[PDB]
Amino acid sequence: ADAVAHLTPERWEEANRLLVRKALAEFTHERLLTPEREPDDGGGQTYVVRSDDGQTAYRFTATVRALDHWQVDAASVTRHRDGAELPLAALDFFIELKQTLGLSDEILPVYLEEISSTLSGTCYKLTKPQLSSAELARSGDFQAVETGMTEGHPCFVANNGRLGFGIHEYLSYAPETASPVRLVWLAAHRSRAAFTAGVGIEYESFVRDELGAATVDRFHGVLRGRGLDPADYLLIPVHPWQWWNKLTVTFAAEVARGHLVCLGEGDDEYLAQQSIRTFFNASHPGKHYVKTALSVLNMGFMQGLSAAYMEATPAINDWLARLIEGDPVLKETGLSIIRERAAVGYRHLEYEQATDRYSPYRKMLAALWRESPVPSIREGETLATMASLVHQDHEGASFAGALIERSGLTPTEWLRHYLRAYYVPLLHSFYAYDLVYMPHGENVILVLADGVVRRAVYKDIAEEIAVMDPDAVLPPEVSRIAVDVPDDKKLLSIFTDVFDCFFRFLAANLAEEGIVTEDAFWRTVAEVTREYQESVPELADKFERYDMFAPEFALSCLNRLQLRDNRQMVDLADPSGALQLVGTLKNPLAGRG
Amino acid sequence: LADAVAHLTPERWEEANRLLVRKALAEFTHERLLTPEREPDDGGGQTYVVRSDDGQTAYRFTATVRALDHWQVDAASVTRHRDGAELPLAALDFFIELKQTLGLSDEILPVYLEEISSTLSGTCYKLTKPQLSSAELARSGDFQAVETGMTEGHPCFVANNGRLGFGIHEYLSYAPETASPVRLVWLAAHRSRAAFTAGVGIEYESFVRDELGAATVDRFHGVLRGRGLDPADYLLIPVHPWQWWNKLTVTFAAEVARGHLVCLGEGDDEYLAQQSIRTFFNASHPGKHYVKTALSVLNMGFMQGLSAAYMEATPAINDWLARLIEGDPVLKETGLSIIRERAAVGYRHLEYEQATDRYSPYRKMLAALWRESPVPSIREGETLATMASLVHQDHEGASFAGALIERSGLTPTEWLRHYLRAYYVPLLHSFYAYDLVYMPHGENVILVLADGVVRRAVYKDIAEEIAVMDPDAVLPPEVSRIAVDVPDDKKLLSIFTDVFDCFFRFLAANLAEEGIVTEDAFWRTVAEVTREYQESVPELADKFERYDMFAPEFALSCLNRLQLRDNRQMVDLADPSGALQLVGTLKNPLAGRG
Ligand SMILES: [Cl-]
Ligand SMILES: [Cl-]
Numbered sequence A: 001a002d003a004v005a006h007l008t009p010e011r012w013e014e015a016n017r018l019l020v021r022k023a024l025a026e027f028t029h030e031r032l033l034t035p036e037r038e039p040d041d042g043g044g045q046t047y048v049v050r051s052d053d054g055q056t057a058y059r060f061t062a063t064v065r066a067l068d069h070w071q072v073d074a075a076s077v078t079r080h081r082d083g084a085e086l087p088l089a090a091l092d093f094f095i096e097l098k099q100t101l102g103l104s105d106e107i108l109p110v111y112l113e114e115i116s117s118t119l120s121g122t123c124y125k126l127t128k129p130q131l132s133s134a135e136l137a138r139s140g141d142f143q144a145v146e147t148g149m150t151e152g153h154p155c156f157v158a159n160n161g162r163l164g165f166g167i168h169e170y171l172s173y174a175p176e177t178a179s180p181v182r183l184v185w186l187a188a189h190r191s192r193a194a195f196t197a198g199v200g201i202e203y204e205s206f207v208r209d210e211l212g213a214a215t216v217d218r219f220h221g222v223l224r225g226r227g228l229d230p231a232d233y234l235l236i237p238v239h240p241w242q243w244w245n246k247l248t249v250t251f252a253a254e255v256a257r258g259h260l261v262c263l264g265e266g267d268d269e270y271l272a273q274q275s276i277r278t279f280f281n282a283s284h285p286g287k288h289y290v291k292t293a294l295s296v297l298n299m300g301f302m303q304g305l306s307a308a309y310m311e312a313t314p315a316i317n318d319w320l321a322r323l324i325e326g327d328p329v330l331k332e333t334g335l336s337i338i339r340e341r342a343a344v345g346y347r348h349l350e351y352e353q354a355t356d357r358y359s360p361y362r363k364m365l366a367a368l369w370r371e372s373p374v375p376s377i378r379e380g381e382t383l384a385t386m387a388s389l390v391h392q393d394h395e396g397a398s399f400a401g402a403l404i405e406r407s408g409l410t411p412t413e414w415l416r417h418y419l420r421a422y423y424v425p426l427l428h429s430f431y432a433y434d435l436v437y438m439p440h441g442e443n444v445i446l447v448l449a450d451g452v453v454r455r456a457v458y459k460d461i462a463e464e465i466a467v468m469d470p471d472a473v474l475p476p477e478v479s480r481i482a483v484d485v486p487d488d489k490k491l492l493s494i495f496t497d498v499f500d501c502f503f504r505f506l507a508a509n510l511a512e513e514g515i516v517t518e519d520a521f522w523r524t525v526a527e528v529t530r531e532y533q534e535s536v537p538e539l540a541d542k543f544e545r546y547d548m549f550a551p552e553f554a555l556s557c558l559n560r561l562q563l564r565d566n567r568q569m570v571d572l573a574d575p576s577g578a579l580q581l582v583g584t585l586k587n588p589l590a591g592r593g
Numbered sequence B: 001l002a003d004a005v006a007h008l009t010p011e012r013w014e015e016a017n018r019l020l021v022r023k024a025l026a027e028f029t030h031e032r033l034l035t036p037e038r039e040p041d042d043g044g045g046q047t048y049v050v051r052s053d054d055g056q057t058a059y060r061f062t063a064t065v066r067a068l069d070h071w072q073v074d075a076a077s078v079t080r081h082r083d084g085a086e087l088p089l090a091a092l093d094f095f096i097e098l099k100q101t102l103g104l105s106d107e108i109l110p111v112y113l114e115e116i117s118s119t120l121s122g123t124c125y126k127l128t129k130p131q132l133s134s135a136e137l138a139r140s141g142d143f144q145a146v147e148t149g150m151t152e153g154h155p156c157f158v159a160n161n162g163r164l165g166f167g168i169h170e171y172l173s174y175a176p177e178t179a180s181p182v183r184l185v186w187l188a189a190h191r192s193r194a195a196f197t198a199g200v201g202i203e204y205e206s207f208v209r210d211e212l213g214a215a216t217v218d219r220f221h222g223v224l225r226g227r228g229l230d231p232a233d234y235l236l237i238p239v240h241p242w243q244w245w246n247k248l249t250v251t252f253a254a255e256v257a258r259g260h261l262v263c264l265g266e267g268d269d270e271y272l273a274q275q276s277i278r279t280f281f282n283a284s285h286p287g288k289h290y291v292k293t294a295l296s297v298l299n300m301g302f303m304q305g306l307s308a309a310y311m312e313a314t315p316a317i318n319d320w321l322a323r324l325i326e327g328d329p330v331l332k333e334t335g336l337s338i339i340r341e342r343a344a345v346g347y348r349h350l351e352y353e354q355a356t357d358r359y360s361p362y363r364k365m366l367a368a369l370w371r372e373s374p375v376p377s378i379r380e381g382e383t384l385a386t387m388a389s390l391v392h393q394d395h396e397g398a399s400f401a402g403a404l405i406e407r408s409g410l411t412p413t414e415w416l417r418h419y420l421r422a423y424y425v426p427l428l429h430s431f432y433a434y435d436l437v438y439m440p441h442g443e444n445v446i447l448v449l450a451d452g453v454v455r456r457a458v459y460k461d462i463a464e465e466i467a468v469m470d471p472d473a474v475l476p477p478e479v480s481r482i483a484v485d486v487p488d489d490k491k492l493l494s495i496f497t498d499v500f501d502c503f504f505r506f507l508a509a510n511l512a513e514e515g516i517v518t519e520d521a522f523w524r525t526v527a528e529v530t531r532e533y534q535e536s537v538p539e540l541a542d543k544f545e546r547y548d549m550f551a552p553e554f555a556l557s558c559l560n561r562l563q564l565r566d567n568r569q570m571v572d573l574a575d576p577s578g579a580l581q582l583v584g585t586l587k588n589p590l591a592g593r594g
């Protein structure tokens, strides 16, 4: 009973209301829905969306903001059929709108699971102590912020499925539980496992730094006790779910043959971060994060980690770190990365022979270590995921709002600092190097001082960065990041991932709360843009070619990807074949060049 | 951590691999996927080779080829060579090497390798158990020592113990070969979605009190009342704990949250999973009902779910069959009985219903039935054993049927005649007199033994397996769904495949290889029992001629082929006869014996 105590009628009702509100907003944004304006209820501002069959009506109020952003009011949402009101039920919403939303017969039931799971997660979150944005901002507690996020991805509606976790596993492993996790360590035979080190890393010292000499010794003692030579093995940390549910079954042959040997649990307590299988070391915050392979489904992908990709991983991070260090614009912004410093991959030789390069069976056992940002900060400074800037607490108060307030700066001065730290590097990376990232909430950490963004740190590099120049000259080990993207889609890396998928929400949240107008938000973005471009006149040709101030850019729809295919939302053999562009949005930078 | 994988060691894995490759060679040969080439020397001819798709790896072995194209590949003889050199025997590599020969597609191969890995892991676990001889097992009289002591699993299917969905910890808690006590989780399910169906003589309120006790039912009522709910609005449903923790609480979270399902906690009685994994025998009270539960795990081509919709007819089908058996003088004479599915409960997740068609696994996630125990029926000096036991061989190769023969003091053929009258004649007569067929394999038959002799057979797994092969059969409305339309030329496969090729093939081979009784006499006994049955019912002589048990040949129906083609839904339930894989014919061992 304890495990399901969060699942009560009142919390489920609230969870449903929240999710339907989001569904209406975001599926409207994506043009799957087209709400009809009704004539004036309380001076107007009321819409209706009808079911596929027209019999059920979802009515609501909304404020429509820039980038076709629908701020659907959660308390206004009502559902009617036959003159009568019905309860708001997310499952029924998806069934009723299944043809409208483009959910096929094959996908609908699995997507309903994902929705059920997301809703369950909201119920769990509703049980947590309900901290205001102001309290969270005053805590200075990096992990209170990390584990206190509630929305998840702001676009995807089915965003917290974590399908593969039973409820007990949810409670042990989901980031919002803040449950401490001990990693399981394996010894992997060197005929199948390879460790790759970044600049300045050496394996023996590395694992001793991370585990301590005592634990390494103990692990050696496990090996010796079974008649194995430690020299023949490399250490690999695994997510306990992966061990108990996958490696001990799927990779039973490896365990049995002694290709993999279970060494026990490491001592240190870790916290799952937003990405679920990346772990922060709570016992020793200055130690590395550990990113693990986790074969659970979330937001269109299994959370596996490719063994083959590990070999290039530290080298790519070294390349990028060195590039950042060398670039005066980037220096001025204060940008840094937390490097993926070391990685270990395991090649299951028989699954390899049985599969192609894209199979999830090749992504079941690998790990990387990413440096902590904690040692880099000074006293006075605190850390927060950038996802926090779009967080709203239980009363609707923006966490960015709370930072603004604590800073004592005007909203636009506060924004300027954030934009110089986070945004300008994206501009300059694009224009100077053809370099893009995946710079969403969870892949940026903010360094804060008295509520002000002093600098931003990027993470999740090797698997996300791209150089949009198929002829790029790059060190051989990093040349796999060069890609061929049509010229007319290159700038979507900013317009989609920054503007439509992050700023859309940030600017809406701030305006709705009365803190700063969309006008001034986007003015500030424009001013920062212009000031950057004026500072690098040698790139003026490029600034003209790829116009940040163009009147429109494509609407790239995110939910549509998942609704079309919620198991492999992107074909990795053809990743740009997934993109779903549906008309254009007016650029809020238009007319501000 | 270590304890959970302790069974996985190089020596046990090596032995597991040798056993599985032995079986693969045998059974895929039987299924004509493989065609071993006889090499010169070493026996009468007796040494064979099978080569990899690309020709470069050779699997060499000895075998004795017995009736029904049964290849008794000798496990110790199996070797693997490539480029003049010997390699270890590795089942994974076997499947990879033979992928095209076996017809494993790109999509299926990796999941099939999982199932193999899991089956192999299970063999390793079983190798860690105390190694009881067939003689000790036979002397024990312990029904559940037999049930949980079986090692082979299905004798045809090579990937037969996948149980994919169990993590290793769950394997150890739930797999039948562990003999681990399981407690059921009880739910209260709201009557707008759940329905209880009773067999003749069953009434819900007394039934649940008989099974749980009034103290527990009252306590469960008190749980509901404590949340402001009326017990009158709810029915009790027992669930497999795996299903609860892994599926119901997630996939059916809306039901838990809305109070459509309320968790009442664990039941007190300890159950043991039977061979079928999600059917539970009450070890605390062996005379109480079995509980068969919905379990969304993958094993031998199917999820182990339980259809809510089918529950409504389930007790009625069992009542019809039990009354039919009781009325039939031939069946009376054999001693046949069933253990009835007496009560059932199904839950309809109304939203999943609207989102799916009738065949979806989402409709099979929450249902249960109760099946009566055979234990109260037996008398002093009688003991029970799954029929699967008759094809069990112990660690030394000794047949459990052999051990029963020995304990009986009968000749092998006298012992066989008793078994055949109890188990096999009812199948014949069911077919000829009623067009009625079952799924009469090892796990669906329980033997009643007295002094090593089979005194009578008890069938189980009725509502989901029985069929009447006459689409115009007149049947009570509630049971008419069992009527099916099978081409005339396929009807008798129900005996030829399921009894002869899938069970007797092994039994006869096991007995002969151990020196107990020749195949010739085994099949003579089968033939004699058949003739004596048919002589006793001359009113059916025209039907006996039309569907000839003594025909020279019958189709080879291949089982592994079904799973290799599709290891997730091996049969499309929207077209169940579209799955059948008939590949040429076998010589009937009854040919010439009519
Ligand atoms: Cl993260
Ligand atoms: Cl990450």
Ligand SMILES: [Cl-]
Residues within 6 Å of the ligand: B274, B275, B276, B277, B279, B443
């Ligand atoms: Cl069973």
